[PDB]
Design a protein around this nucleic acid. Structure first.
Ligand SMILES: Cc1cn([C@H]2C[C@H](O)[C@@H](COP(=O)(O)OP(=O)(O)OP(=O)(O)O)O2)c(=O)[nH]c1=O
Ligand SMILES: [Mg+2]
Ligand SMILES: [Zn+2]
Ligand SMILES: [Zn+2]
Length: 898
DNA sequence: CCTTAAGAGAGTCATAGTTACTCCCGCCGTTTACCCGCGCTTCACAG
DNA sequence: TTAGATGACGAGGCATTTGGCTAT
RNA sequence: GUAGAUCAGCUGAUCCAAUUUCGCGCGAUGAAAAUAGCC
DNA sequence: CTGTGAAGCGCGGGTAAACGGCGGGAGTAACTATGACTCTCTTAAGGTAAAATGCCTCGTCATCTAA
């Protein structure tokens, strides 16, 4: 009977019809959920403004009544009868005297050229090449010097005519070590980014880095004595960098200005001193030593959660400043720093630095005539964020005192992160005076609010029906210009986190398009693995941790990533799941599993939120959403981790190590953990290996060669022809039989042995040993034949080479090969007599034991690194030789089928 | 020279868990549209 | 007062690494 | 016909292959700074 | 023409008769969480090796004890 007015579905009850109308038809139900406004309760934010206006009029005029207060409050939204009936109350008549007391004081050649570009760029700058592969292109400057200059030159040349701070905002803001000389240990402690381009002056980073520290100290102290630097070091070049991934004009670029490396080093030391000297307002979570993005997103999510759950009025604006650094006036900044109580030498230094600012614009290696700069704060100077924080402190100070949203008895008034601002309010009135305060003190400094991006979210609930409701009509102004309303279904991005009206939602991501782009770039197969490992997956980590995501979507994302890796390395689908995700030291390929990694990072970031210095974040930690999220994160972390033996923390690495070493194909890789030199071929030395050979090593490493036993997984209902050896050995045809046991593969085993013997012998000859290869020694047990014997300084060593299977202990195999020579006794005397030395104690047995998958025996590695002086870059090549010998064995076994 | 190794993950479908609301009924507290005047203003009225 | 033994600190030589990502 | 190989119908497409182009073995392919945070 | 008295108007104390915030109470649409199942399933050769920072090792110097 009950039928929906918007989709005509039929329901059993009015209850289910209402629950349907809430979820399936949001805007229509938000229209029906609108409260009436006949007898609205007086929020205290309205009460404070009415009381303070009445108090200032009792000071200013002496005597007044409600008929004047209706005139003094135009946009207040109360009738004169309401004003009278509020005015007759006793807490208001207390607050009026309380305020009065204070106030009365071709196609083919193009791809060959693209290969030539990509392979050079991958070696010059790997991160740039990876960003080029993922996005599609780079080098985003798409305008001429004229089109850049005719827009940007009247902006830079104009002096900002802002009148500077007013004494009201200075009084609101008001609620010695600096310019001492710089020491040597201060220069040593203050780390610097030496991977940097030089300025127009042309002194490179290594040229300044070679200068000794005490001479740099006396040049810095000399420049502090003058109050200026040499003028050739003070000049700047500007390169325009795009703000949007497809810029539509010169206004969508930013003027990043680069000066000399000594200026940036000196200003970085002064920047760390200035950051230690004057901390900003506690609501400014930007350019300080705290994880402010976590804090701002957590507080905003908690406020938006409690707003819906407890049915309270909640008015939220998101604000931005247009061209924030590029518009600050020299006058307002320098006199604010003077009235902040900074030393006069520092203020004179900043005034003389920005007085003499001249810049050359450079667009695609075409340079402009020099530009005189009238608006301050260079994008690219170390002192510039710390100076912009001083500007933001005035704006944060000028907010009204008790306007905000009270979450867990903390009155959250504002959240700041550089120029980004979120304002919170209880009523329309409190937000409107907050916007007027922010706008006014912004215009005092030369800043203008970004009207393209400023927007307001506004919730007014219904009592007596218990309905949440969001406004749709535009109700707030900057200077008369109406602000935009965020609708109930609108989705917006805050600090790289996706938000809606109910809080955090799932981050919008482009995994499949990026995996398509990597799959088509002209790359070697290991380069695709490195771009996936180091560059693609850490992009979406931030929004997955700070946002909200389910286990299902993470699980499908891991399925997509594993399918991409299985396409690139030509792996079958029954490769163990832990091999993609276990570490390189453990024998895995170290592609991060998003399902396992993201709860671990949510625990490790959000668990520290209780220990924050900021009280608002500690209030947010008590909120219901973050508590529920942290319980889910702890449950999923306990599902996909093992407790580490030493530090007792949960770890994802031991979970993947246990699952890899427990699996059938990964079982032989269990000793790779003890010897990190065995797997340097996977990631460190992969560029020294051809792309065919790398994929053949990957197939050799986790047994993925199509032998008749692994090929017949699930299909072993057939006869012995589906299981036994192709060469007729009448045994079960494993891959290890083909590589290690088959009569067809005997000469390849001999060649692999002789190659490893020759390489070890050449390395021992470089390490000054007197190597004799293959002694035919006739001891009384029979003809015995060690691989190599050698002498150095009277000490003798016998070395023998093994390439073995991993279903036994490798160290046991080393000892079993060792004791054949070391416990022979008489043969040691034959070795000593051949080397010309009498003492049998000075002759030591040693073995060179490595698996056919390229895993070193640990004790044999210690013998070859300690008894013999072989360096470990020699020892990193023996796994490559064993792996390539194994795949040559596999290739010859498949060729000889005839 | 070498001394057999040996299923596993993605997709389907049914049921359970839970989240985010619904509508119904009663009660006190709050709000303000009016009732009821007192002090000043304006035309009748005294001089 | 001088000589020998022990402990601490500094210098020299050799070997290993030389990141990535997000916000503004 | 392709740097080389291969599949199609002299051209396209795909590779485990793939340093083009400009210049005299060898140089250049010309990006990009700052402050925090996280791994 | 000029200042005061009856009627008019604004400016304030008071009431009451609705709103509206909320407790208690019974419900459910429509999303993810678990589990038991089912489905699906590999091959192109050949003989192979510059610079900066941090850690490790060795030497030199200083202090304490004994003669
Ligand atoms: C993104 C970014 C910002 N900044 C600084 C410069 C900006 O003035 C300040 C705030 O950044 P933005 O607000 O992102 O940049 P903007 O204000 O100049 O651009 P818009 O007008 O579109 O808002 O942070 C950098 O120095 N480097 C950067 O990469
Ligand atoms: Mg901005
Ligand atoms: Zn409907
Ligand atoms: Zn065989």
């Amino acid at each position: 009977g009950w039928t929906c007015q918007f989709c005509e579905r039929t329901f059993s009850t009015n209850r289910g019809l209402g629950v349907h109308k809430r979820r399936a038809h949001p805007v229509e139900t938000n229209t029906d959920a609108a409260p009436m406004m006949v007898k609205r309760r007086w929020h205290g934010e309205e009460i404070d403004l009415l009381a303070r206006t009445e108090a200032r009029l009792l000071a200013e005029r002496g005597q007044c009544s409600g008929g004047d207060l209706f005139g003094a409050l135009p946009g207040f939204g109360r009738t004169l009868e309401a004003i009278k009936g509020q005015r007759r109350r006793e807490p208001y008549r207390a607050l009026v005297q309380a305020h009065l007391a204070r106030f009365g004081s071709t196609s083919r050649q193009k791809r060959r050229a693209e290969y030539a570009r990509v392979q050079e760029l991958y070696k010059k700058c790997r991160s740039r090449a990876a960003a080029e592969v993922i996005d599609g292109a780079c080098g985003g400057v798409g305008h001429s010097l004229e089109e850049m200059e005719t827009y940007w030159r009247p902006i830079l040349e104009r002096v900002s005519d802002a009148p500077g701070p007013t004494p009201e905002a200075l009084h609101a803001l008001g609620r010695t070590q600096l310019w001492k000389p710089i020491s040597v240990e201060e220069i040593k402690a203050s780390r610097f980014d030496w991977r940097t381009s030089p300025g127009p002056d042309g002194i490179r980073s290594g040229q300044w880095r070679a200068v000794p520290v005490h001479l740099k100290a006396e040049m810095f102290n000399a420049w502090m004595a003058r109050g200026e630097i040499p003028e050739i070091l003070r000049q700047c070049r500007t390169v325009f960098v795009p703000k949007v991934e497809r810029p539509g004009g010169p206004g969508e670029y930013r003027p990043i200005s680069i000066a000399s490396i000594p200026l940036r080093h000196f200003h970085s030391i002064l920047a760390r001193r200035l950051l230690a000297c004057c901390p900003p307002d506690a609501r400014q979570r930007g350019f300080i030593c705290a994880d402010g993005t976590l804090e701002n997103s957590a507080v905003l999510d908690a406020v938006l959660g409690d707003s819906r759950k407890k049915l309270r009025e909640c008015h939220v604006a998101v604000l931005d400043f247009a061209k924030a650094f590029d518009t600050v006036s020299h006058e307002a900044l320098v006199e604010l720093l003077r009235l902040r109580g900074m030393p006069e030498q520092f203020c004179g230094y900043i005034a003389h630095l920005y007085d003499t600012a001249s810049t050359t614009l450079a667009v695609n290696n075409e340079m402009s005539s020099p530009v005189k700069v009238g608006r301050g704060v260079r994008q690219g100077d170390p002192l510039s964020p710390i100076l912009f924080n001083v500007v933001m402190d005035l704006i944060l100070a000028s907010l009204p005192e008790r306007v905000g949203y009270r979450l867990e008895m903390e009155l959250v008034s504002a959240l700041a992160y550089a120029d980004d601002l979120v304002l919170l309010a209880g009523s329309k009135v409190g937000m409107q005076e907050s916007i007027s305060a922010v706008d006014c003190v912004g215009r005092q400094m030369g800043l203008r609010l970004n009207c393209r991006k400023s927007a307001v979210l506004s919730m007014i609930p219904d009592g007596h029906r218990k309905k949440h409701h969001y406004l749709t009509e535009r109700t707030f102004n900057i200077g008369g210009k109406p602000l935009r309303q965020v609708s109930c279904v609108e989705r917006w991005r805050y600090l790289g986190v996706d938000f809606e009206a109910s809080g955090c939602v799932t981050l919008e991501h482009s995994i499949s398009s990026a995996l398509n782009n990597i799959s088509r770039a002209p790359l070697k197969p290991q380069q695709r693995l490195e771009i996936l490992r180091a560059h693609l997956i850490p992009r979406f980590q931030h929004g997955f941790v700070l946002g909200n995501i389910s286990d299902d979507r993470l699980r499908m994302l891991d399925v997509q990533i594993r399918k991409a890796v299985g396409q690139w390395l030509r792996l079958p689908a029954d490769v163990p799941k832990a091999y993609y995700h276990a570490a390189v030291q453990d024998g895995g390929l170290a592609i991060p599993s998003v399902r396992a990694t993201i709860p671990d990072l949510i625990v490790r970031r959000f668990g520290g939120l209780d220990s924050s210095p900021w009280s608002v974040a500690r209030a947010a930690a008590k909120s219901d959403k973050i508590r529920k999220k942290l319980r889910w994160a702890w449950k999923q972390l306990r599902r996909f981790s093992r407790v580490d033996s030493t530090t007792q923390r949960p770890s994802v690495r031991l979970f993947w190590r246990e699952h890899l070493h427990a699996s059938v194909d990964g079982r032989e890789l269990r000793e790779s953990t003890r010897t990190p030199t065995s797997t340097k071929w996977i990631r460190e030395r992969c560029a020294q290996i051809t792309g065919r050979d790398f994929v053949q090593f990957v197939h050799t490493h986790i047994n993925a060669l199509p032998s008749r036993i692994r090929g017949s997984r699930g299909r072993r209902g057939g006869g012995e022809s589906s299981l036994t050896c192709r060469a007729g050995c009448k045994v079960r045809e494993t891959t290890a039989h083909i590589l290690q046991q088959c009569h067809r593969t005997h000469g390849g085993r001999i060649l692999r042995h002789n190659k490893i013997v020759s390489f070890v012998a050449k390395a021992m000859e470089e390490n000054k040993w007197t190597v004799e290869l293959e002694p035919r020694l006739r001891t009384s047990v029979g003809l015995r034949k060690p691989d190599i014997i050698a002498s150095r300084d009277g000490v003798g060593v016998i070395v023998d080479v093994q390439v073995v299977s991993g279903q036994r202990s490798l160290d046991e195999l080393h000892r079993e090969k060792r004791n054949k020579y070391g416990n022979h006794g008489e043969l040691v005397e034959l070795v000593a007599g051949r080397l010309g030395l009498p003492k049998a104690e000075c002759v030591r047995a040693t073995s060179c034991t490595i698996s056919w998958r390229g895993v070193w025996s640990l004790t044999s590695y210690k013998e070859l690194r300690s008894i013999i002086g072989l360096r470990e870059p020699t020892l990193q090549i023996v796994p490559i030789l064993a792996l390539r010998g194994s795949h040559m064995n596999w290739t010859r076994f498949n060729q000889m089928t005839s």
